[PDB]
Structures are given as C-alpha cells and as structure tokens.
Design an enzyme around this catalytic site. Sequence first.
Site, mmCIF file in Angstrom:
data_model
loop_
_atom_site.group_PDB
_atom_site.id
_atom_site.type_symbol
_atom_site.label_atom_id
_atom_site.label_comp_id
_atom_site.label_asym_id
_atom_site.label_seq_id
_atom_site.Cartn_x
_atom_site.Cartn_y
_atom_site.Cartn_z
ATOM 1 N N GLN A 35 0.872 -1.177 0.000
ATOM 2 C CA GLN A 35 0.000 0.000 0.000
ATOM 3 C C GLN A 35 0.887 1.196 0.000
ATOM 4 O OE1 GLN A 35 -3.608 0.004 -0.091
ATOM 5 N NE2 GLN A 35 -3.056 2.104 -0.670
ATOM 6 N N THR B 152 -0.662 -2.561 7.199
ATOM 7 C CA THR B 152 -1.040 -1.255 6.615
ATOM 8 C C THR B 152 -2.482 -1.006 6.665
ATOM 9 O OG1 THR B 152 -1.231 -2.135 4.357
ATOM 10 C CG2 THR B 152 0.927 -1.343 5.050
ATOM 11 N N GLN B 153 -2.963 0.109 6.034
ATOM 12 C CA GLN B 153 -4.323 0.457 6.106
ATOM 13 C C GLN B 153 -4.587 1.395 4.971
ATOM 14 O OE1 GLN B 153 -3.986 2.248 10.136
ATOM 15 N NE2 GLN B 153 -4.680 4.160 9.181
#
Lengths: 250, 242, 212, 198, 245, 222, 243, 233
Positions: F1, H1-2
């Site tokens: 991400q 994570t996000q």
Amino acid sequence: MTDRYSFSLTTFSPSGKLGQIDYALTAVKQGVTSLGIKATNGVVIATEKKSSSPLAMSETLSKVSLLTPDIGAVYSGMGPDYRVLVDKSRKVAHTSYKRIYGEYPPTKLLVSEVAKIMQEATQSGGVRPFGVSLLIAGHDEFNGFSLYQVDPSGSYFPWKATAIGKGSVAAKTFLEKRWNDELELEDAIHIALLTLKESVEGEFNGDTIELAIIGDENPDLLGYTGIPTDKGPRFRKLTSQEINDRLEAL
Amino acid sequence: GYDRALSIFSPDGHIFQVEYALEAVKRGTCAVGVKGKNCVVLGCERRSTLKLQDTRITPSKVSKIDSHVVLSFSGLNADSRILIEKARVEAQSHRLTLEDPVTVEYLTRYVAGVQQRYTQSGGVRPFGVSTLIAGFDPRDDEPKLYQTEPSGIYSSWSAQTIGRNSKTVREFLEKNYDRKEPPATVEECVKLTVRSLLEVVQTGAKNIEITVVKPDSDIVALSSEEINQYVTQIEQEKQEQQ
Amino acid sequence: TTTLAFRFQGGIIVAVDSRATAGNWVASQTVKRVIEINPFLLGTMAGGAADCQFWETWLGSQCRLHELREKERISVAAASKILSNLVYQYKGAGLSMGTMICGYTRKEGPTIYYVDSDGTRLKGDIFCVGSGQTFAYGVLDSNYKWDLSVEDALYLGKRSILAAAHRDAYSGGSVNLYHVTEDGWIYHGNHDVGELFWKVKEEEGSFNNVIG
Amino acid sequence: MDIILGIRVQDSVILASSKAVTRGISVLKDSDDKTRQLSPHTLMSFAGEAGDTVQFAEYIQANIQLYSIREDYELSPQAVSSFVRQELAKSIRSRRPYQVNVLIGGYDKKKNKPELYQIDYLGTKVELPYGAHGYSGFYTFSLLDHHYRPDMTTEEGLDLLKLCVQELEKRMPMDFKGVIVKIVDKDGIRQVDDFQAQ
Amino acid sequence: GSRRYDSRTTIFSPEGRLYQVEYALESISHAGTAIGIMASDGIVLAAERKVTSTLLEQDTSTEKLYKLNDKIAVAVAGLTADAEILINTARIHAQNYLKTYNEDIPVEILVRRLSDIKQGYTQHGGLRPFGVSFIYAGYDDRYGYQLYTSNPSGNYTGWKAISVGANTSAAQTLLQMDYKDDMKVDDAIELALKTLSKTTDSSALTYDRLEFATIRKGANDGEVYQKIFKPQEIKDILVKTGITK
Amino acid sequence: QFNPYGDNGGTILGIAGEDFAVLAGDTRNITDYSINSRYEPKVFDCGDNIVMSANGFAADGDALVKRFKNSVKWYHFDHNDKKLSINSAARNIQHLLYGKRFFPYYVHTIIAGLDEDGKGAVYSFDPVGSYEREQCRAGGAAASLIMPFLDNQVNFKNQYEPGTNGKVKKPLKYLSVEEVIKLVRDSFTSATERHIQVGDGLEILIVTKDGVRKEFYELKRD
Amino acid sequence: DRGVSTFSPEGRLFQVEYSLEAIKLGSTAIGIATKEGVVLGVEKRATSPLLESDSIEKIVEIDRHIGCAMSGLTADARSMIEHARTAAVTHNLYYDEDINVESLTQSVCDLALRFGEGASGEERLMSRPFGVALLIAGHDADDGYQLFHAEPSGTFYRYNAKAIGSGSEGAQAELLNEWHSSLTLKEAELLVLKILKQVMEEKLDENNAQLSCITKQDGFKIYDNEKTAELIKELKEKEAAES
Amino acid sequence: TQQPIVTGTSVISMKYDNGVIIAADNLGSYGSLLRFNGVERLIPVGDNTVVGISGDISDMQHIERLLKDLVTENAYDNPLADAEEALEPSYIFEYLATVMYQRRSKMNPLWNAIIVAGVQSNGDQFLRYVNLLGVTYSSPTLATGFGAHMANPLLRKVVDRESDIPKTTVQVAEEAIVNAMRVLYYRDARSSRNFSLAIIDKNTGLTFKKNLQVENMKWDFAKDIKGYGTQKI
C-alpha cells in the site's frame, strides 16, 4: 532490584554430606507409615488416611495419587513437597509419551523422571531441594509389577516390598515373613492390615487406612463398554466399606 | 544473577584468589623449557609410581596449539582443558581471517586474556594452571619462550621452570646457560634438560618426556630408549668431575 | 565504469574514470571512484556507492587497529577476507560492492585481490573490471609486457580507459591515474579526454590501422 | 555452471576441474584452479556459484582442521562426506543456501580402499566409480558406460577423461576450456601437469 | 540481596583446594564398589552391591551397570541421582558425534567433555558438583581396549586395572600382584572372582551381591559385545572357580 | 500500500570560492501544484560555519537534520566545546544516511562553509550515503539547468576563447563575493520562469570567518 | 564477601581505598610534558640470563599519537587497553580525527564503576575495581602536547608532570625543582635518566629502563633500546666526571 | 497497513494580528454515509491551543486519547502550569510529530493530517501543518482535506505573507472563515451542517463557539429547475 540468588543452597559439609538432604530425611522418618507390596498377582499399596477433623472431608486429602494410569505412588515426608511433585510428574508423563510411543512411560523410566526433578532441585539454588520419599508401585506390560524407592536426593533402588515412615524395620519383618512371592492380591491385603495393626496402636480401623491396588480390570477401566481397542487402566482405589469387608475376611 | 563478586581485593594490594591459584601449581608436577639457538626443548614429567596405569590413554602434557606452537603446563588437568580448547580456536581464527600463519606474541596475549578476564569478572574464579607457551614465528629460526600465570600476567624468559621445586631448577640452570653462548647442538642442550629434570623426578628415564622443537613444525618427541642412554652417560660424567 | 589494475615490473598501474552526469551531459568530471584505505592501499568505489563509502573507510580503521594490535603490516589478503565475510551476511537484503583491493607490500610484493558483492575472492595478475571490461582488456593485452617502465605503463592504462569511454556511456569525463609503489601510492593527474582523444587516434593504430 | 568431472580408477581417484575463465574472445585468466586440501588424502573440488564457493569452502575447512589438531588425528574421507552433507542439509532449509555441488576425492588410508563422494547442494551424497553433474553427463556417461567398465588403471583414466572433455567443448555449447587433473591416492595428492592426451 | 544471605564455598582454600570437591571424593569412598580389569581379549567388570536383601530386588543387575553405547559402558561408584544426569547427557553427546561424522565417539573425547561439565559446576555458577566417580569401560581401534576413571575434579587417567568406591585399597593391593599383562577373558574371570571374595567381609560373596559384565569379541556375538550378566550367569561362574565361600 | 515517498521540489546551489563559500536556496516549498510555503528557510545554519540544505523530499530532510542537530550538541559536551569541522560533519552525515537504507532516502544534501585551513568548501551527497568534495555544485530539481552555465563561468570547463578554441582558452580566476552574488541572482531569476519549484524568495547565506551573513533578494510570486 | 556499596563514615568507599593499595606496589612511571614533547619513562627492572629483558616493556602504544605507561598490576591494564583501543578506533572512523586524552579517561572510568552485585542504575558484572593507575600521554591539535593521570577510582587530572609508582614520593619532589616553563624535550629525557639513576639500587641499563617520547611529525614514538642505551652511555660518563 | 473506511474531512485556519481562527465540521464518515454527526474534531488542549485533526476516525480516536493524557501529564510536576514548561502550541505539535514520523518510518502509519493552531502566551501566533507522509510546513493559511484545495485560495487573499497579518482584524478574519466554510458545505457534502469554530485571542483568551450551523443559505439551485420529478404523462 529483584532476586540475585543463584548460589546453591545445597552444599558440601566436611564429611562429604549434604546438609539439606540430611535435614529433609529427618522429616521423612517422622512421616506417615506407608508400605508397598508386590503380590505377584498384583500390587497393593496402603498408607494412612488420617483425618484433620471429623467435620473435615478426607476426599480432597491426598495420600495416594495416580501418577499415570497403571501406577500409583504413596510417600512419607512433607505433604506440600509431595503435592507439587506429583504435578510435574503427571505433566511430562502425558506430554512426552502418551502419543509419542502411544502409551504411558514404563515404571523404571517414570522413577528416573521423578529422580531428575528432585536432582535439579538439589543442584540449583533459589530453592531448597524436595523433602520427600516415594514408593512408586506399578504395573507396565513390559516389566510386570514393580516397586521402587525414590529418595529425597533422587537416588532410587528396586524393591519388591518395603516400608518407610515411622516404625519401618519391624513392619518389613512381618511382611518378609508372611509373603515370599506367588500370593493372591486379596491375601496381600489381609497380610497388610495385620502388619499395620501391630505397627499402629491407640485406635485402628479401615477408615484410617486408604488402600489402592493396581491389579484388576473392569470394562469400566477400559472406560467404555463396547468393543476393545486397548486394555486401559488397572488402578483402582477401594472405598472404605470394601476395606472393612477385607478386614472381616480372615 | 551470578555476575556478582567472587574475587575480591586484598588489603595488601594482591588478590586472595590469585595467591591461592599459584599454590595448586607448586604441589603439582614440574615442567621446564631450556633454549638453544637452534631449538627449544620442553621437558615434562610422567612420574608413574603405580604400574596399573595404561599410558597410551593416560593424558599427555604436550598440546598442539598450532603446528609450529606447543603449550605445556603444570596444574589441574580439568582446568587446563578449558584453557587449551580456547587457545586452539584462536590460532584457527587468525588463520581464517588474516590468511596468515599465527604469530606467537598474539597467542600469548590470548592465553593471558581469558585468565585475566576470569579474575576481573564476577561469579568466575581464575584457572589452577600455569603454563609455558613456546614455538617459532613463521619464516623464523630463533626460539620463542613465554610464561603465563593464572593471574593473567605474562613475560618472556630465556628459560623457565615451574611447579614443584622451581627454586632448585632455576638455581641449577643459571650456572649452565649464558645468553652470549647458548648451546648450538641438540644433543648437549637435551643433555642439560634431562639432567635438570633428573634431579627433581628422582628416578626417571621413562618418566621424563622430552620434546624438542626446531623451526617451523619440526617437532619430535624423544623416546625412553634414548633417554636411558643420556642417564647412563650422566652417571659417567659425575665420576669425571669427581 | 571501467576500473583496472595490472601488476608489472614497476608495481601496479591503477587506472580509473571520473564522471558524473545529469542526463548524458557530463555535469562534472569529478566523482569518487578511488577510496583511500591507507597510504599504500587503494580500493575503488563502484557498485553500491554507499556500501563502498562506508565499508572501505571502515576497512581502513580495522587495518590501523591490526597494526596496533599485532604490530605487523596487513596483507591485501587479510584486507579482502574481512570484507567478504561481512558482504555475505548482508546479501539477499541489498549490499552491492565492486572493489579491487590493491597494494604493494614488502611481505608479498605487488599483490591484487578482486572482491565482489557475492563474496568471491580472486587473486590474479591482470584485471579489468567493469562493463567495458572486454574491450579494455583487448587494448591492455596487445601491448602488455610485464617488463616495462612506469612511464609507458601509465600511457597504456589511460588508453584502455579512453577506448572504453568512447563505446560506453558510463565513463569519460576525465581519466585519473595512480601508481601504487612499495612506499605508497602516487597520483599522476587527471587527463582531459577532449585533449587526449586526438593524440591516441593517430598514435596507437588499434581500431585505427585505417582510422574509423 | 562449472564442469567438474570425477572418475575413480583402480589405483587413485582422479578429479578433473576447469582451468580457465573466459571473457569474450580470450582468456583473461587461464591459471585457474579451485580445490582445497582438507587433509593430505581427502580433497575437495568445487563447482557452483562463485561466491557461495569460497564462503562454504573455508567454513568446512576450518571445522575439520580444528578437529585435526585437537585430536592429533587425521580423519577419514567418509568422515568428511557425512560432515559436508549435514551442513548442506541445515542451509538448504535456510533462506540463503549455498548452490555448490562438490566432489570430494579421497583415499581412505584406514580401509585401504579408494573412495569418491559426489555431493549435491541439496545434501545428496553418493559414492560412485564415475559421475558428472548437469548436462555434461548426457555426452559422457554414454562413453563411460560402453568403453569403460570397473577395474582400469591410472593411465587409462587419463585418456578417457581427455576424450570426454574434447566432446564437451565441441558438441555441448558450454565452454570452460578444458580441465587440469589431480590424483588423490595413498601417497597424497599430485596435480597431473600433462593434458596433451592425458 | 544475596551477599550476606549466601556464602562462597566455590572459592579456593589456603592449600589450593576447593572445599566441595575434596569432600565429594569422601562421599564416593563410602559408596558401593566398582572395579575395572581390562584384558586384551575383553573387559571384565565387577561391582559389589553393598548390602543385599530379599526385600530389594537383586534381579536388576543394571543398578550400577549402565550402557552408554553398545561399545562403551561405565560402572558407577557414588549415587544413582548424581549418575543420571551425566549418563543421559553422555548418551546425547554420543548421538551428536554419530550424526555428524557417521562414526561413534572414541572413549577419550567423551571423557574430556564430561569432566569439563563437572569442572564447570565449581568454576562458575556457585553451584555444587556431582559426587560420583565413573569407571569407563571402552573401545577404540586406535587404542584397543580402554579403561579410564574420571572424578568430580575432572582429572582423568588411563588404567588397565582401577577401583573406586569402598574397599578400594584392599582390591588394588591383591590385583597388582596377580595381574597378567596380556590375558584372555576366562583367565580374567578367575583372577577377578579370586580378588573379590577376599575384599568382601566374611562369607558373603554371592551372585546376588554382584554385578558382573564382560565385553568379549565373540564369534557368535559381534565384535565388542557387551554382556551384562543377569543373576544366573553369575551363579555359574562362581561354581566353576568354586569361590562362593 | 504505502510508501510516503514523493517529492517537494525546491532548488539549492553551493559555490566554493577563494576564502568563502555560499549556500543559496529558494524559499518556495511545494507538494505538486500547491503552495506549501512562500517563505520557509531552505538554507539553515547548523552552527560552526556550516550551513546545510537537504533538498528533495521534506520528510527525510527534517529527520536527517534532527539526528544531526543532536550530534552537534553531543560533540560539544563530550569534547569540551570543540567546534565541528566541515569534513567531520560530512563523515557524521555519511553514517546517518547510510544508517537507513532499508527505508531509503531521496534527498540531495549539500553543505557549505569554510575548512579549518581556510579554503571555501562545498560537499555534495548522494541520497543513501557518499560524499565527495566539489568546487561547485548545483543541486535539487533544477540542478541540470544551472550547472551547464556555471561550468563555463566559474569553472572554465567547455569554455574557450575565440581563436582556435583548443589551445586558446579562458582561464580560472577565483571569483569575488560580489561577482558570485551577481551570478547567483542571474541563475535564480532565469530559474523562476522555467520551474515552479523555484520562486517566492531567494535566501543566500554567505559564510565567512566574520560569521554567517544573510542576504535576501526577491523572486516571482503567482 | 565485602560490601560494594558500603562507605566509610567520611564517605569513601572500601573498594576505592583498596584500589589505592595495589598501585603503590609497581615500578615508577614518570612523565614530564614539555613544549616539544611528552616524555614517559618507566623502570622495567629485572636482569637475569634466564630472562628475556628486552622483550618486555611497560610502555605500550594505544594509537599513533597515544601511549600509556602503567604502575600497579599489569594484568589489569590489559582490559583497560582493550576498551580504550575500541573507543578511539570508532571515534576516528566517525569524525576522521584525534580523540582527546581526557575524553578517553572518562570513557574508561565509566566501566571501572562496575564491581560486585548489580544495580538498577548499572549492571555490575565485575568483582573488583582495577588495581592499576596510568599515565596516558598524547597529542591533540587543539591542546598540543599533554599528560594525564587516570586513577581507577574515577578522578583524572591533567598535569604537566606527575609520577606514580612505589618510588613516587621522592620522584615528584625532584620533578618540581627540575621543572620550569622553558623546559624542552632533549633536556627532559636526560633528566629522566638522572632521576632514574638516583632512586635505583643498581646501575641504570636499558634492561631495567625504557624511554619514550612524542613528537607531532611521528606521533607516539618508542625511544628504542639502541637509542636509549646510547643515552645511558652518555649519562654514566658525564656524571662520573662531576665526581 | 491500512487504507480508509472511516474519514473526517476539512479543518481550515488563518492568522490575524492578535490571534488565530480555526473552524471544522463535526464528523465521523463511513464513506458517504454521515454515520456520526457531532464527533469532536476541534480538541481544545488548554485555552491557547486547538488541535484539528483530519483523516481516518480510527486514527483520530487514538490521538484524541493521547491529547487528553497530555493534559494530565502537563498537570504533573506543578498544578498551576500553563506557560512555566507546559501547555504551549509548539509542545503539543512536536509531541504529535515524533509519533507521526516513527509510525510512517516503520510503515504502519498514522493515517491523519494535523493542523495545530494556537497563540503562544509567551509569544505570537502558531500555525503549523503535519501529514501522513512526514512532510510538515508552516504558512499563514493552512487547510487539510478538501479545505486545502478549496478554502486555502480564498484564505490567501487576506493573509499569505507576514506583512498582510497586521492588516487583518478580528472582523476581517472572521468574515474570511465564515465565508470559507459556507463554500466547504456548498461544494462538498461530507462536511456536516453543524460545525464548531474557535477564535484564540491574546485579548480574552479562548472563545469557542460550539455547535454553530451554516446560515446565509444558498437556494440558488432553485433558479435552474428544468424538473427532475415533475412528470406529466
């Protein structure tokens, strides 16, 4: 801050002795008359039941513990030391053998495992050593019925009958004379009540004897009433009424 | 925690534990090293009183630290294994890393260093051993002889003697060596070494074990047969100087 | 980058480029490419710049520490083998190194060891290392002669660099020359590639017998 | 990779190992040899990745050499091959294996028998009268089986090995420019200088 | 803390001794006897179990005889408990040598390790050492039959006849005389039993007060087959020598 | 991400002269097309005649700088207020840069000042380690545009005087503080037009043995 | 054993006091810092034909600008040197320059504090303090030539000259009279020999004395056996002509 | 994570001569569902700092706790402390930033973007921005979220240099904040009709008007009806 104690608390004296083991043994001599007999058609162990109080349960009280299914132990010494020790013996016996070789440890192998616990505790500081002696009476299908002594230091030796506690030597004399192998389990129960009546005077009953045998089977001790797959326990502790029945049987 | 004290000061500015380490060495057997200018001789006792020892598996006093380096000792065998092991590892560590054969000075620093640590550091006591370390530096034909104590101190010595009756063997040796004219031939330097070590072993000519180190890995242990011969000779010499 | 070393009668000739670029236009002719280990030992920057910068200065410190510790001059060998042990641990996580550890010691003579990111350790006598290696070795090879004096030896080192600089776009700003002697290394200047090209073309007749 | 052949003949154990490093047209180096003496009658030759090679090679050497001084005793070639195998079989789990295939050529002075060990990077150790690794063996096993069958001397091995190497450089498109050959027997280790038909 | 709640007995003494070690040997000299006779076709081992009864099993005749391998075994003089930790760890130390090099440990390596662990308990830790002395009954093809003894101090010595335990002094004085330098097993057995009776007070020497093991080459058993004599084979040998009296 | 790594523009320029050295930087701070700041000192005095600018990505600049500010403090305490050398400071940075590369850095750092033997010095860094000493160094986004002029007029490279332009050349003169400042204003005024990463203001820190001197020239505002 | 945190009614620790007792038993180390160098001299002592007397010395180099001479226990001075080399090497790598002699003494003195049972302030790993005191001599480009006395207690003082050892009581007293602020390197070395002769019960040879010097074109430099003896040769004749 | 599931958008700010103004809707979004309407996202930290936090609510809740612990730990060491060594805008911001940088550097990041506005009681105005990428900057106008895009060009016409700061008054300042926010509700529907707005004065301390609502309504859309439900068959 916190402990720093790592210096051994068991140390040698000028004679070659070990102070802590000497002390601990005095306690054991003063402890409750316990014996063990191999009847050859079984093994019978008896120990003194006691009560703290008449208003006290003695169901909870532990004088005979099953270490592993076919094996019982009894002792003379210090009760609290006994209780913890039984626990570490039960744990390792279950984790390390009961699906590894697919069965309980053999008697001699279990006596060595106890022996080790006591010896760790004697070598190492932070803690004093166990103050106990055990009589481990057993059955294993690869050695028959056995009787061992476990000493406070963890020295062990094989026996086929013995007694430890107070009033040992004379208790062994009566047992030596009455039993010399090839004997019914029932008969060894009878001999055992007789040896202990002479040993304990003031008041005597079968409600102050706690008796266990390893030397029977029921379907109930396979733990199921179906189709066998294995043999299962042969430990059976008797109730007080059954013991009074054997006291009535001459 | 067992990092706390186990070695303490003296009020005299010694250390109690180092003074007591040296005593174990004295009660002990005797080891000696005498230098030529072609060799370095090491004599070591094997005074088997009893005859029920089997002596090919009865421990020796000579270790390789390296192929051109020896260590001999006087003191408890038990402690000496622990030091001997750490010293072999250190020779191989240099060999691996520097791509170079080992130099005697650094090894001596290493032997000194483990013993020195254990006096200084807590919940350990120094070894029960004094040593002699000798050998030859690479591409070098001059003899090297070091002494280390379990204090951890270290020195070079032209000759040194240790263990039981160290006084007697120093005192003798002092009359038979000069740095200006040390011996050139193996035979006469060995004769002197066997003669000193005769005088303290009592009876011994199979109980004395000589190992003579010449430059770079020519290390040869003389035998009983040979030693008995030098002792005969010494009994002829002592009625030529009567 | 094309970086080279050869052992010959006089010692070792270390010849190197210097060149930093913004695009293909050569912004400055000066970048680090020689890392100075010690006064007699060179190691070349190339591969992982950062890995080289940190670890060859580090190497210099540990060497200085050996000269205290053991009171002995270091081998080029001892130098390389330390480097390699550390290089192999940080592999598979990054770490890239391209160096040649070059020295002239009294206890070995002119000595060259090649050291890479994978942990090979190789001794040879003639090296070119780079991505212009094959061409540079051609030029080196046909006028190689171990016996030879320092002056000619230098001009040959320099010609191999230019030859490499021309075909490949990873060298050629200016050429830096170093002669590693017994008593330490001697800088011989930065040669403008611009002035140097015109001389070499006429002179060597190599790829240039009939000029092209 | 690196073409490394071994043939165990009657009198000695012959290992053949590549002699040059080729960059383009020309051999930059042609003075190559990659072998390490483990002991005076245990030899290990090496092929694989070139940095995994020196790192393993000196690691194994160091351990066996620590045992030699310690015990003041020479260890068997059998002893070494079990040792090499175990160490490979710890690293093959780990996240950065060696990718090194070895041949250890030894004369077992304690049986008085010759022994040849071929050890994969995996840890597959096999004792053989001849062996090869990789694509080499397709050309050379077909000669070795037909023209050679056990119980042949030192001289015979030399010629056999030459034939093999010549077919590998022609017909197989790997190039490694011949081998320089070494013999491990009772009297230790020699490099056979000749390579004209031997 | 622990400074004035503990003591230091693991320090040296004004003779160069360590308190607990010197004392440990004393503990051993009143423990049961172990004897080692090395022959050159075998190893003969004898041990006295001091005090035996018909309430103890005498049937277990591994009580001081433990096999650590099928090529090395020890005879124990001192405590069962002390013994147990070094046996189990020695057997483990074996398997490690066996795994690494595919060949069994020599006797000498295994002794040197054992001794280093035992030295260790007085050398650091503050701990107490073991109080048991071992007689190593062992093999090499470098050294033939091997006979060692190692002590809680960690010194170890090569033997071809040794004793530790009680009555050490009596056994060794007869043994040195009657020794033959190279001898067969059966001769060894005669010599041993003869020595044994006269080291055991009054009429007492029995099969069931003895533990016997012999290590023979055989030719229906394998090279270095250890036979740890169970009661009945002791009964036989006593009658053959006639020494049961 | 997630990767925070981007760019924030800005432009810095370091020039070593005859006795002096400059670290000139614009004062515009961006993230894309948005204005983060129209004044924010992009040359900063770390002390000891050392002025420092980490152009590139801001997030790494702030970090690099804080690690280093505490090192300036610790060097003083531990060595009784002995002032930090440009070369020594450069080594100290090398180790900082090299200390993270598992989280890799995207800055062009430049330090300028005086060395202790009295010659102006500018050192340029590569984002994960390395430094080397240069005479002149243009830095940042607009590095590539500034350097080709700079090379002619300061350094007298790819510069030759009309004749043959090959054995006739224009030679090296070490510039004056006045003449350097003219150059720097000219570079920056041309730069504003062509780059939206340069503008707002020009802070020049000129560094001398009389201290650090501040100059301010104005630049373009949208 | 003996407390590690137990002070005298004054408030001076037992362990510190005991540290002071081992120091007083070594052979003298004498330093004079001058304006051209630092001189460090030791009495090495012992002369025997069964002794290699010119293979052992008490003046050991830390760095190419730092020495130390010691007095007290010598085994202890090995741990002090191992710590000191590591600390100096790591600082030369980080800032490229000389470490300060005062700075070095503080880094070492920090690890002199461990002894005994641990703290919750500090993890005390040793058993005793160090039983050697040191004269560390050096050069730095920011204070020139210097001479430092590190006590194992924690205190370190800068001096222009100081003697330590057994024979320090006399030695120091001589140092003051001989000391002046126009003293040079060449005079100082001759004077060292005078002091050493006086206090000896022997003839001064280089197999019982060793000289050393610091010049900043060569760093810490050992005055070699060959040179030290030539200096001894010159002494004996000149002294023995004032009588 | 996000990656986001819960958002808060838009906290806007400006400096005037003798204070600052900051205004923010009160919001916990679940996308385009206005799930929590009324969630605090101006957090007064003392009476001289207001912390505006935009971005993920899950992250916002954690900082919300952390600020309330900072007050409790600011009463430690002396209870009457409020300019002695605690409770200044620079302290609250540096604290947040050290955590912000550490979390991103290990890549398990705080997914917020922060505006610390206050007026030091020792000095002059404080206005500084910090985001999830570790970029931090100062300017006389600042906005997060949507407001960075849309409100900030409106802000810059009043103040955007130092010189324009003395020339803006409380009234001029307040008119820009009230204008900007009307714009934020008009072009972006996330932003809640209720907001809270606070003006942080040198002259009168902390004035916080809570739960104020957009007014001066636009109904301009009504002119452009060409129907969207008005059907004739």
